[PDB]
Amino acid sequence: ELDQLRQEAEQLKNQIRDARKACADATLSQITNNIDPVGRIQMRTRRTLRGHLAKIYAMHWGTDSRLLVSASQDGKLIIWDSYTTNKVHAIPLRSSWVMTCAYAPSGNYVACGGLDNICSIYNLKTREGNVRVSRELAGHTGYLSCCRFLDDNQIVTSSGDTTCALWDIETGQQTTTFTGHTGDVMSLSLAPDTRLFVSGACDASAKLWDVREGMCRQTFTGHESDINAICFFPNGNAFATGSDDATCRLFDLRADQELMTYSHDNIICGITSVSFSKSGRLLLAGYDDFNCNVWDALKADRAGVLAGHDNRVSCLGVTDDGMAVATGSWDSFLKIWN
Amino acid sequence: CTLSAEDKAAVERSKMIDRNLREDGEKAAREVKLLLLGAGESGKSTIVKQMKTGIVETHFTFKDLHFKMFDVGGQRSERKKWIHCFEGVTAIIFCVALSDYDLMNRMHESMKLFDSICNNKWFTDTSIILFLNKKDLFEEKIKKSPLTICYPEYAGSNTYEEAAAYIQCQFEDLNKRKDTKEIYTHFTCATDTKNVQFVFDAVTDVIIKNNLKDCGLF
Amino acid sequence: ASIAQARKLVEQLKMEANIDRIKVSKAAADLMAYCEAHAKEDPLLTPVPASENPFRE
Amino acid sequence: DIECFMVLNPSQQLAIAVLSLTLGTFTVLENLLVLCVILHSRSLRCRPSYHFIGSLAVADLLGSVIFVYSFIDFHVFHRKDSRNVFLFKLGGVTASFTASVGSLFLTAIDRYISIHRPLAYKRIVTRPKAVVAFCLMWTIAIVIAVLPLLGWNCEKLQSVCSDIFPHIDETYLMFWIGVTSVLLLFIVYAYMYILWKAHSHAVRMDIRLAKTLVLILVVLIICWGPLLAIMVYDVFGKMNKLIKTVFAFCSMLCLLNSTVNPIIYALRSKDLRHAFRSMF
Amino acid sequence: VQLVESGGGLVQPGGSRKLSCSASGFAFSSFGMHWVRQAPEKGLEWVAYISSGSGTIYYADTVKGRFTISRDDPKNTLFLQMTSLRSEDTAMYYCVRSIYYYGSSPFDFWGQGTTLTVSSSDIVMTQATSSVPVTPGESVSISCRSSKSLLHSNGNTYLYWFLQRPGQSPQLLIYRMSNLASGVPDRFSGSGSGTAFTLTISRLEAEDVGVYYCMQHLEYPLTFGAGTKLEL
Ligand SMILES: CCCCC/C=C\[C@H](C)/C=C\C/C=C\C/C=C\CCCC(=O)N[C@H](C)CO
C-alpha cells in the first residue's frame, strides 16, 4: 500500500545523489590557488550607542546607510543617527517579547514581531508628529523569527511552526504560503532581484522558494544541527549558512551542491549571525564566545578578529555602500567598526 | 562650537528622549517577575483564580509589593529556542497534582519535567516554589488504593502523612545543585487563602539572600 | 492519511530530479571573476584615507 | 629640637627595622595581587562594591610605603630636615591614613544599605554615585592633609607645639583624633545593626554573619585603640621617656591593619576567590 | 491640524496687551514655536521663539526686555505678553510651527493671524525685482542674493522659499535648497550656490499669483528677504 511509495522515494533520493556526484569535477580550493591572499585585517571601533537597558535582539540598516533601527527585551524600538549618535525616534511596544525587526527600503515604515505570534507595522512619516501603529498581521501559530519588506505593500514572514507566508498589508490577509519543512524556521534572506528567497529550519535543511508560483525548487543538506543564520552572495547565485556545529558552509544554486566549509579546531560554540561584504570577499560571523570572526570567502583562511563585547553577539550588519559594520550583543551596547 | 542652529535642537530632542527612557527604566525595576510552569491537569487555573494567543500575563499586589506572573503553556514549540528569554526571573512556580498517582504515568511525566527544568543551565541560581494540590483527593484514594503503583519499592504505611512525606522527599531529591538554590514546598487544596503569603515570604527571603551575596558579605 | 503524505513526498521529490546542472568548475570560476571585477571599490578591504571616511571622528 | 624627640635605645633600634621591613613587604604584595584580580575580571569590574576594596588597597599601599620611608629615615639615620619637608611627609602619611579609613566607612555604609532596604538596595546605590563619593572623599582627605603647609604652623605662629611631632600645634592633632573616632563609631554601629536585623529575620545566616562581624569589629578595635589612647593622653597630660617608647611601638601596630584588611575583605568573598582560581 | 489666534485690537501708546494661540490636531508638546509679524504693507519680520520643553528662548533685538513669550503644554496654549507698546508695533501677528530632527521640514504650517493697532552683524537678503508681469503657460524665474555664504561645513545650505496669496497666510514651497515640500506640485523648482539662488516655474496657472519671500536659517535672528510680486 505505502511501502512502494517509500521505496520509490528512496530510489529517487539515490538518483539525485548520483546526479549531484556526476557534476563534481574539481573542488573550489584547487581553482583558488596561485592567488595572492588578503592579509591581516585590522578594524577599529568608531561609535558606541547607549540608552538600551536590556538585551538587544535585532537590528537593520537603512538604504541611505546613515540611519539604524534596533530592538531590545524592554518594550522599545529605537532609531539611531549613525554619524552624530543622536536619537531620532523611540517607539513603545505593547509586548516586551520581541525577536526581529525590519526597515522599509523607502524609509516610511518599520516592522516588529516576537513571541505573541503577530507582526506589527508602524508608520514613520505622518502629519501629527507621532509614530502610530499602521497594521497588525495575525494568522501564525508560532513565534515569529524573521520578516523582510519587498515593497511598500508586500512582506514575507517566517514562523516557529513549519510554514512561511506572504502578506498584503492593505487587506491584512495572506496571499501565499510555503509549507515543506519539519521543524522550526529560524531565518530567511531575499535576493537582489526580489524573485526568490531561501530558508533554514531546525531539521538541518535549507530550501529555495519561488515568490510568484509558490513552489519549492531545491533543497540543501549537510549540516548536523540547527541552522540559525543565512545570507545571499552579492551576485545572487550562492549563499552561506551557519549552524550549532560551530561551522559555516557555502552553497551554490546552479551547481546544486556545497562548495566550501569554514571551521576551526579551537571553536566549539554555535554561530548566531552571518553577513557578507561588498564584492563578497570577506565573510563576517558572530559567535557565542563574545567575539566576531572574519573569514576569506575564497579560502579557508581567517583574516581577522573583532573582540569588543562582554557577552553574546546577537546580530550584525553591513551598509549598502560598504563603509562600516554594526554589531549588537547581550551586553546592551551596539558598536560600529571601520 | 561648529554646530549650526539646527543641530542643537536635535541634541535637545535626543536628551529629552534619554530622560524619558531613564524614567521608564526606573519605574519598571520595582516589580517582581515570576514564571509559572506545570503539566496539564495540575491546578494552575485554581491558583491563578486564587491570585486575581501566545504567552499570558497576570498582575497582583500584596503588602505594597507588585507581582507579575508569566504563563507560557500555550506555545507548543521547541523550548530550547525561547526559554533563555526568561533568564532573570526572581523565582519559578511549579504545580503538581497529588491525586493523579494511580491514574505512561502522569506522576513520572511530572517528575521528568521537574528534573529537566530544575537542572537547566540558564536557571542555575533561581529558587523554586513547589505546590502540591488536591490533598483531600489523595487522602481519599490512599485508603482504597495503596501507594505501590507508582513506587513498587515503597515499604511504609497507608497513611496520609507518611505518603505525603515520601512524595515530597522523592520530589526534593532531584536537584543536583544544592548550594546555589533552595526549594520551598507547600501543600494546598482547592480552598485556601494563604498561598500569596507563602509566595511573599519566599520572595523576601530570596531577595535578602541575593542582596547579601551581591555585596560580598557571603 | 498515510497515502496523501507519501504521494506528495514522491511528487515533490520527482520535480527536483529534472533540473539542469553545470560543472563545479564553471560555477567556481564566476565567483572568482566577480570578486576580481569589484575589488577596486571595497572600503573594508583597502582602508581609504581619513578624508572620505564619514566616521573618522 | 629634633634631637630630644629621638629616644629609641641602640638595642630597640634593631627590632623596629626588622619588623618594619618584613611587615611592609607583605602589605605591598597582598594589596598588589588583590588589585590585579579585580582588574582582570569583567564581572568584578562592573560591580560598584569592589571599587571601594580597590581604593582601600591603593590607600594602604601608599600609606605603608610613605610611613616606612619616613620612619626609617627618622629613627635610623637621624636625618635632619627643615620644617617644610617634614610637614610635607606628615601630610602625606595623614592623607593615606584618612583615605583608608574613609574607604572602610564607605564599604560599611554600602553593607548597611543592603540590609536596611532589601527591595530598594539596587535602586539607591549606583556606579556614578560611587564614583562621586570616592572622589569627594579623596579630595577632602587631600585638603585636610595639605591644610598645615599653607598656614597654622606652630613655628610660624604663637602656640604650644606638640610633644610627639615637631613643628605641630596641639589642635590639628586633635582634629584628626576627633574625626577618626566618629568614623570608627559609625563603622561599629552599622555592623551591630546588621547583626541584630539578621538575627531578627532568621527567627543559618546568623551563625555566619556573627562569625564574620565579630572578627571584623575585634580587629578594628584592637588595632585602632592603643595609638589613639596615647595621642589623647599626650594632648591632655605630660610626656615621659616611657610614654615616648610605647608610642613608637604602637605606630608599628597601625601598619599591621594594612596587612590584615586584604585577607578579611578579599577572602570572605566567594566571587573574588572564583575569579582568582579561574585566572590561575 | 489647526492653530487659532486670539487677542488684538486698538491700544493707546504705553499700554500692555496679551496674545494667545490655541492648537488642535497634533502633538503640541513636541514642536517648537515662533512668532512672526507683517506691517500693513511691508514684508515679514521675525519676533521670538520657544523650544520644545521651554529650555531655550530667543528674542529680536528690537523687542529685547519688552516682550515675553511663554507656553502651557497640558492646556495646548502659547502666550505673548507685550508691554510699553510704541507706534511701530502696529502689524498682523502669526504663530508658526517647527520640528527639528534629521530630515524634517520646519516652518511648514502657519496660522491665520491677528491684527494689532496702536493709536498715533546680521546677514542681509536682497531681491532686485518686483511687479513682474507674466502670462499663463509661460516659464518664470526669480533670483535672490545674500551677504554671506549660507553653505555649512556639514554640506547643508539653509534657504527657504515662501509664497503668500492675496488675503491668505504664507505657505512653504521649498524647505531647503533643492527640497520640495509635501502637497505642492512639481512645477516649482529651486537651485543655487554660495550666495546666489533662484526659483524657477515651468508653467504657471491662474492660482500661482502672489508674493514670494526668501528666508535664511543659518543663525538668529532669522532675517527675511524682500517681496517679489507677480501680476497676471
Ligand atoms: C598629624 C597626625 C597624624 C599623623 C599620622 C598618624 C599616625 C602615625 C602612625 C603616627 C606617627 C607618624 C609616623 C611616622 C612619621 C615620622 C616620624 C615620626 C616621629 C615622631 C615620633 O615618633 N615621636 C615619638 C615620641 C618618638 O618616637
Side-chain angles (χ1 to χ4, degrees), chain D residues 5-8 66-71 74-75 86 89-91 93-95 97-98 148 163-166 168 172-173 176-177 224 227 231 243-245 247-251 254-255:
Chain D
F5 286 65
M6 282 170 204
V7 155
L8 199 75
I66 301 166
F67 169 94
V68 168
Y69 181 58
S70 295
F71 206 75
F74 190 79
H75 278 294
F86 185 72
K89 299 153 176 290
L90 185 70
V93 171
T94 310
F97 279 29
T98 326
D163 313 0
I164 328 167
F165 295 81
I168 302 285
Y172 177 60
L173 188 146
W176 177 100
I177 296 156
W224 279 116
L227 190 74
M231 269 186 207
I243 297 151
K244 278 190 173 183
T245 56
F247 184 73
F249 301 121
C250 277
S251 304
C254 202
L255 172 60

Side-chain angles (χ1 to χ4, degrees), chain A residues 284-322:
Chain A
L284 283 79
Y287 290 78
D288 289 345
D289 61 71
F290 307 173
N291 260 51
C292 173
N293 275 292
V294 186
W295 304 84
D296 196 324
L298 311 178
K299 292 183 171 187
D301 305 357
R302 185 203 296 177
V305 180
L306 249 67
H309 283 286
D310 285 326
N311 209 336
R312 197 174 292 203
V313 167
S314 312
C315 46
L316 60 96
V318 180
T319 39
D320 309 63
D321 47 286

Side-chain angles (χ1 to χ4, degrees), chain B residues 4-6 9 12-13 16, chain E residues 51-52 56 100 158 160 176:
Chain B
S4 43
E6 292 205 36
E12 276 179 343
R13 186 197 168 77
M16 273 173 94
Chain E
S51 166
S52 199
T56 303
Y100 299 99
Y158 305 96
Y160 296 62
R176 249 194 296 269

Side-chain angles (χ1 to χ4, degrees), chain A residues 53, chain B residues 24-26 28-29 31-32, chain D residues 119-120:
Chain A
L53 302 181
Chain B
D24 296 343
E26 287 172 3
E31 259 154 350
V32 189
Chain D
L119 311 175

Side-chain angles (χ1 to χ4, degrees), chain A residues 87 152 211 310 326 330:
Chain A
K87 290 180 172 64
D152 266 21
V211 182
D310 285 326
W330 281 358

